[PDB]
Scaffold this motif. Structure first.
Motif, PDB file in Angstrom:
ATOM      1  N   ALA A 182      -1.479  40.288 -20.409  1.00 40.43           N
ATOM      2  CA  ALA A 182      -1.273  39.586 -21.661  1.00 40.43           C
ATOM      3  C   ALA A 182       0.218  39.440 -22.037  1.00 40.43           C
ATOM      4  O   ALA A 182       0.594  38.497 -22.745  1.00 40.43           O
ATOM      5  CB  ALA A 182      -2.015  40.308 -22.776  1.00 40.43           C
ATOM      6  N   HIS A 183       1.063  40.360 -21.563  1.00 41.55           N
ATOM      7  CA  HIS A 183       2.469  40.352 -21.981  1.00 41.55           C
ATOM      8  C   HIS A 183       3.432  40.433 -20.826  1.00 41.55           C
ATOM      9  O   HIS A 183       3.785  41.533 -20.368  1.00 41.55           O
ATOM     10  CB  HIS A 183       2.739  41.516 -22.917  1.00 41.55           C
ATOM     11  CG  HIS A 183       1.877  41.509 -24.141  1.00 41.55           C
ATOM     12  ND1 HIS A 183       2.059  40.615 -25.168  1.00 41.55           N
ATOM     13  CD2 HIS A 183       0.835  42.288 -24.500  1.00 41.55           C
ATOM     14  CE1 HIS A 183       1.161  40.840 -26.114  1.00 41.55           C
ATOM     15  NE2 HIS A 183       0.405  41.851 -25.731  1.00 41.55           N
TER      16      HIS A 183
ATOM     17  N   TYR B 166      -4.957  45.096 -48.395  1.00 46.35           N
ATOM     18  CA  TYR B 166      -4.222  44.441 -49.471  1.00 46.35           C
ATOM     19  C   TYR B 166      -4.552  45.024 -50.855  1.00 46.35           C
ATOM     20  O   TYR B 166      -3.664  45.124 -51.720  1.00 46.35           O
ATOM     21  CB  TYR B 166      -4.455  42.933 -49.465  1.00 46.35           C
ATOM     22  CG  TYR B 166      -3.592  42.254 -48.410  1.00 46.35           C
ATOM     23  CD1 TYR B 166      -4.168  41.575 -47.347  1.00 46.35           C
ATOM     24  CD2 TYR B 166      -2.209  42.292 -48.496  1.00 46.35           C
ATOM     25  CE1 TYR B 166      -3.376  40.936 -46.372  1.00 46.35           C
ATOM     26  CE2 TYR B 166      -1.405  41.668 -47.542  1.00 46.35           C
ATOM     27  CZ  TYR B 166      -2.001  40.992 -46.479  1.00 46.35           C
ATOM     28  OH  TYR B 166      -1.222  40.370 -45.530  1.00 46.35           O
TER      29      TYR B 166
ATOM     30  N   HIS C  14      11.415  42.163 -31.068  1.00 46.86           N
ATOM     31  CA  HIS C  14      10.556  41.316 -30.271  1.00 46.86           C
ATOM     32  C   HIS C  14       9.600  42.170 -29.417  1.00 46.86           C
ATOM     33  O   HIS C  14       9.900  42.535 -28.274  1.00 46.86           O
ATOM     34  CB  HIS C  14      11.439  40.346 -29.431  1.00 46.86           C
ATOM     35  CG  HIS C  14      12.277  39.437 -30.297  1.00 46.86           C
ATOM     36  ND1 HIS C  14      11.717  38.494 -31.147  1.00 46.86           N
ATOM     37  CD2 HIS C  14      13.619  39.333 -30.452  1.00 46.86           C
ATOM     38  CE1 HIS C  14      12.683  37.852 -31.790  1.00 46.86           C
ATOM     39  NE2 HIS C  14      13.845  38.338 -31.384  1.00 46.86           N
TER      40      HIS C  14
ATOM     41  N   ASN D 108       7.300  41.299 -34.580  1.00 43.85           N
ATOM     42  CA  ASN D 108       8.223  40.265 -34.157  1.00 43.85           C
ATOM     43  C   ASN D 108       8.857  39.540 -35.347  1.00 43.85           C
ATOM     44  O   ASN D 108       8.166  38.940 -36.194  1.00 43.85           O
ATOM     45  CB  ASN D 108       7.471  39.246 -33.259  1.00 43.85           C
ATOM     46  CG  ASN D 108       8.447  38.276 -32.534  1.00 43.85           C
ATOM     47  OD1 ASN D 108       8.962  38.579 -31.471  1.00 43.85           O
ATOM     48  ND2 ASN D 108       8.693  37.121 -33.138  1.00 43.85           N
ATOM     49  N   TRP D 109      10.182  39.610 -35.402  1.00 45.21           N
ATOM     50  CA  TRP D 109      10.953  38.824 -36.350  1.00 45.21           C
ATOM     51  C   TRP D 109      12.352  38.606 -35.843  1.00 45.21           C
ATOM     52  O   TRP D 109      12.861  39.405 -35.051  1.00 45.21           O
ATOM     53  CB  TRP D 109      10.925  39.326 -37.797  1.00 45.21           C
ATOM     54  CG  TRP D 109      11.327  40.761 -38.135  1.00 45.21           C
ATOM     55  CD1 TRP D 109      12.610  41.275 -38.325  1.00 45.21           C
ATOM     56  CD2 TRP D 109      10.433  41.850 -38.349  1.00 45.21           C
ATOM     57  NE1 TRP D 109      12.539  42.617 -38.631  1.00 45.21           N
ATOM     58  CE2 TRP D 109      11.216  42.995 -38.655  1.00 45.21           C
ATOM     59  CE3 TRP D 109       9.033  41.976 -38.312  1.00 45.21           C
ATOM     60  CZ2 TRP D 109      10.642  44.248 -38.923  1.00 45.21           C
ATOM     61  CZ3 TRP D 109       8.468  43.209 -38.570  1.00 45.21           C
ATOM     62  CH2 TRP D 109       9.271  44.333 -38.874  1.00 45.21           C
TER      63      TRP D 109
ATOM     64  N   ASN E 122      -1.911  33.502 -24.695  1.00 44.64           N
ATOM     65  CA  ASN E 122      -3.003  34.243 -25.328  1.00 44.64           C
ATOM     66  C   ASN E 122      -2.625  34.812 -26.667  1.00 44.64           C
ATOM     67  O   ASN E 122      -1.446  34.949 -26.979  1.00 44.64           O
ATOM     68  CB  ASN E 122      -3.440  35.392 -24.390  1.00 44.64           C
ATOM     69  CG  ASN E 122      -2.372  36.496 -24.277  1.00 44.64           C
ATOM     70  OD1 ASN E 122      -2.312  37.361 -25.131  1.00 44.64           O
ATOM     71  ND2 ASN E 122      -1.538  36.459 -23.234  1.00 44.64           N
TER      72      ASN E 122
ATOM     73  N   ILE F  81      -4.233  38.174 -28.892  1.00 48.22           N
ATOM     74  CA  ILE F  81      -5.262  39.267 -28.848  1.00 48.22           C
ATOM     75  C   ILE F  81      -5.085  40.075 -30.117  1.00 48.22           C
ATOM     76  O   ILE F  81      -4.004  40.676 -30.328  1.00 48.22           O
ATOM     77  CB  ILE F  81      -5.134  40.112 -27.567  1.00 48.22           C
ATOM     78  CG1 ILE F  81      -5.326  39.234 -26.328  1.00 48.22           C
ATOM     79  CG2 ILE F  81      -6.138  41.255 -27.581  1.00 48.22           C
ATOM     80  CD1 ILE F  81      -4.982  39.929 -25.029  1.00 48.22           C
TER      81      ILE F  81
ATOM     82  N   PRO G 160       2.323  35.427 -42.460  1.00 54.37           N
ATOM     83  CA  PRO G 160       1.964  36.855 -42.443  1.00 54.37           C
ATOM     84  C   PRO G 160       1.351  37.322 -41.125  1.00 54.37           C
ATOM     85  O   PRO G 160       1.715  38.396 -40.663  1.00 54.37           O
ATOM     86  CB  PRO G 160       1.008  36.984 -43.631  1.00 54.37           C
ATOM     87  CG  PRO G 160       1.284  35.778 -44.464  1.00 54.37           C
ATOM     88  CD  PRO G 160       1.505  34.646 -43.500  1.00 54.37           C
TER      89      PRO G 160
ATOM     90  N   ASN H 273       4.054  35.125 -36.143  1.00 55.97           N
ATOM     91  CA  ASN H 273       5.492  34.951 -36.264  1.00 55.97           C
ATOM     92  C   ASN H 273       6.258  34.844 -34.950  1.00 55.97           C
ATOM     93  O   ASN H 273       6.287  35.783 -34.163  1.00 55.97           O
ATOM     94  CB  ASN H 273       6.047  36.084 -37.145  1.00 55.97           C
ATOM     95  CG  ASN H 273       7.461  35.770 -37.614  1.00 55.97           C
ATOM     96  OD1 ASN H 273       7.671  35.340 -38.737  1.00 55.97           O
ATOM     97  ND2 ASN H 273       8.433  35.973 -36.729  1.00 55.97           N
ATOM     98  N   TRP H 274       6.864  33.684 -34.702  1.00 57.06           N
ATOM     99  CA  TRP H 274       7.671  33.513 -33.521  1.00 57.06           C
ATOM    100  C   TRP H 274       8.535  32.250 -33.647  1.00 57.06           C
ATOM    101  O   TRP H 274       8.165  31.278 -34.281  1.00 57.06           O
ATOM    102  CB  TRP H 274       6.829  33.536 -32.211  1.00 57.06           C
ATOM    103  CG  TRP H 274       5.754  32.493 -31.954  1.00 57.06           C
ATOM    104  CD1 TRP H 274       5.934  31.176 -31.560  1.00 57.06           C
ATOM    105  CD2 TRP H 274       4.341  32.686 -32.052  1.00 57.06           C
ATOM    106  NE1 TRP H 274       4.711  30.550 -31.421  1.00 57.06           N
ATOM    107  CE2 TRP H 274       3.717  31.454 -31.713  1.00 57.06           C
ATOM    108  CE3 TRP H 274       3.530  33.784 -32.393  1.00 57.06           C
ATOM    109  CZ2 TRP H 274       2.322  31.298 -31.708  1.00 57.06           C
ATOM    110  CZ3 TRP H 274       2.161  33.629 -32.395  1.00 57.06           C
ATOM    111  CH2 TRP H 274       1.565  32.400 -32.057  1.00 57.06           C
ATOM    112  N   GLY H 275       9.694  32.323 -33.053  1.00 57.69           N
ATOM    113  CA  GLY H 275      10.615  31.231 -33.064  1.00 57.69           C
ATOM    114  C   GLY H 275      10.879  30.773 -31.656  1.00 57.69           C
ATOM    115  O   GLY H 275      11.983  30.335 -31.352  1.00 57.69           O
TER     116      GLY H 275
END
Ligand SMILES: *[C@@](O)(C=O)COP(=O)(O)O
Ligand SMILES: *[C@@](O)(C=O)COP(=O)(O)O
Lengths: 336, 336
Positions: free
Chosen positions: A13-14, A274, A328, A333-334, B294, B296, B330, B333-335
């Protein structure tokens, strides 16, 4: 082997990760990254995404999963550290449990003897119980994730091993956690208050009346169990020996600025987390605590346990800058 | 009220969102964003993070949560659309359920009658049951998330309302999903095969033997239930009327490139989802399907149901560029 299948899945997956075999451990695909302190952690499987989901730029260089709820053996930790060593030393983050301390401490010595500059940070944030089932002192739980991110950012920016270690130990003294379970990974309308991440008993079993009331009890406990003095050993690489260091935590207090982590232990609906966060913000405001940043989701789990934890970590402008720095990884991730 | 508490918590946690009252809905804090197509969806609460966790740059402009497992009322949808309207049209993504279709369709007419250029995309990706308890046709499930991201990227970059609608409709004909439950949000060692996200019955109840065997049954079902011809109405804003359009799906086949979403319905540990992914990659490779990207995790849930779904979406280079485009919400998130 199911654990084998799970790690194979993680790797497929990564592509930013590399799964090693003989022994098994996981690293960033680009490790070793030359010129930066390498950061490593590990512990039993069953807390996903901790720690493998935290491997990547601005966080861990690698991690060493063990069998379910069982520390990885020392060979895994040693080989992972050797693989990620970028020539600036390796920092080992160790959660406070009998097995993890033993195995990570043994690997630390093997590393030193092989010429690797290494040191350690012990995490003991769970305020619920001193001297649990498998811990000397306080248990290491969700604040480990916050410390990994913050020390990760410092390492990525180029801070020295000593600087990263010192920051990790200081953050450890400023972060406080507590968890509850409504069901194991067993009483009906009763909760295990102050439960641990591998199923250890809490302060007690008590009635669950409502979400808001549970959060009030957890929050009150964080405010009153904050004070803590204890010894935590760290590896002194100059002397090549374990150094006993007295460490002190102050209670959370009015005027503190904090990062809040509302963490799913496994099977709590996100909608409920929340709700928890809503009550937590109310209590913090009433107590003079300013929540500056937050994380809400499944970050340090216990298989499919139904429950959640709250972590509050005191911070300042410099630490918030480390928080805001890029990360990352699979789970976090930001960018800038 | 618990929902009130949970929505307040979401808003306090994310400064990038604005929670509105009278009526209740959520938008990007920066909406309306002038000059771009606005994207909205909604449905019952109980599926978090769908849809509120998908509000942000590159994705939804806003979302309309209803009561647990219940469509929002037409006033919520209408007011949310008016709040986010950027002068280039509002696109409504509607999951295929009796209540959602009725309410979003009613809101569509009110918007049109109020001068707002609007159109719709209906999602009917669940291959398991045709004409469930609460659906005419096939149920709209996790592919809704992939479509919001892809059409969200198209809108974000400036594509026209017609182009964003056409893309959504095309993607809907290319995405296929199936879910299973081991426990509701009832049998012991049995699973509900082809379960729906509000608890709807599936194809049948059958024995659970292993994770790999379950994935095999799910995957085989996606391959054999793919072919589908049906009518989906859409709002023709030039004529001011519903248009009955025949739409066709081809089965997944050798040579297809796909995005795979392995989705927690609520209480499945992440470790197990990686094991699911591991088997899914094997099956895809055998069938000639190439998994290009993917996701997950917990993306379209059913409260605390124990189970998971698999979604496979056929894509090409243009669609993969839309997937890789920046998103800041929320949950996603990815650039890059
Ligand atoms: C637990 O998974 C945290 O790593 C394992 O700890 P012990 O094996 O109890 O030391
Ligand atoms: C479900 O939560 C999908 O939005 C609610 O659907 P219905 O109210 O059953 O249409």
């Amino acid at each position: 082997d199911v654990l084998d299948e799970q790690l194979a899945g993680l790797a497929k997956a990564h592509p930013s990760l590399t799964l090693h075999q003989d022994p098994v451990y996981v690293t960033r695909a680009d490790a070793p990254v030359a010129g930066k302190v390498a950061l490593l952690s590990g512990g039993g499987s069953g807390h996903e995404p901790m720690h493998c989901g935290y491997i990547g730029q601005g966080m861990l260089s690698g991690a060493c999963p063990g069998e379910i709820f069982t520390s990885p053996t020392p060979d895994k930790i040693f080989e992972c550290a050797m693989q990620v060593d970028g020539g600036e030393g390796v920092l080992l983050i160790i959660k406070n449990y009998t097995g993890d301390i033993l195995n990570f401490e043994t690997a630390t010595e093997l590393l030193h003897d092989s010429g690797v500059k290494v040191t350690t940070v012990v995490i003991d944030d769970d305020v619920a119980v001193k001297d649990s089932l498998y811990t000397a002192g306080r248990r290491g739980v969700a604040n480990t994730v916050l410390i990994e991110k913050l020390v990760g950012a410092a390492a990525e920016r180029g801070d020295s091993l000593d600087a990263c270690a010192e920051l990790g130990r200081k953050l450890n003294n400023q972060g406080h956690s507590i968890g509850i379970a409504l069901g194991a990974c067993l009483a009906d309308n009763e909760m295990e208050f102050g439960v641990g991440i591998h199923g250890e008993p809490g302060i007690d079993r008590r009635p669950f009346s409502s979400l808001d009331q549970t959060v009030d009890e957890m929050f009150d406990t964080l405010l009153v169990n904050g004070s803590y003095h204890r010894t935590l050993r760290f590896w002194d690489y100059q002397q090549g020996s374990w150094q006993e260091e007295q460490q002190t935590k102050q209670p959370l207090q009015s005027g503190d600025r904090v990062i809040a982590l509302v963490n799913n232990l496994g099977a709590t609906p996100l909608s409920e987390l929340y709700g928890v966060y809503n009550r937590l913000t109310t209590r913090c405001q009433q107590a003079g605590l300013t929540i500056e940043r937050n994380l809400i989701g499944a970050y340090c789990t216990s298989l499919d346990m139904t429950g959640f934890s709250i972590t509050l970590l005191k911070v300042d402008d410099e630490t918030l800058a480390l928080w805001d720095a890029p990360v990352h990884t699979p789970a976090l991730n930001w960018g800038k």
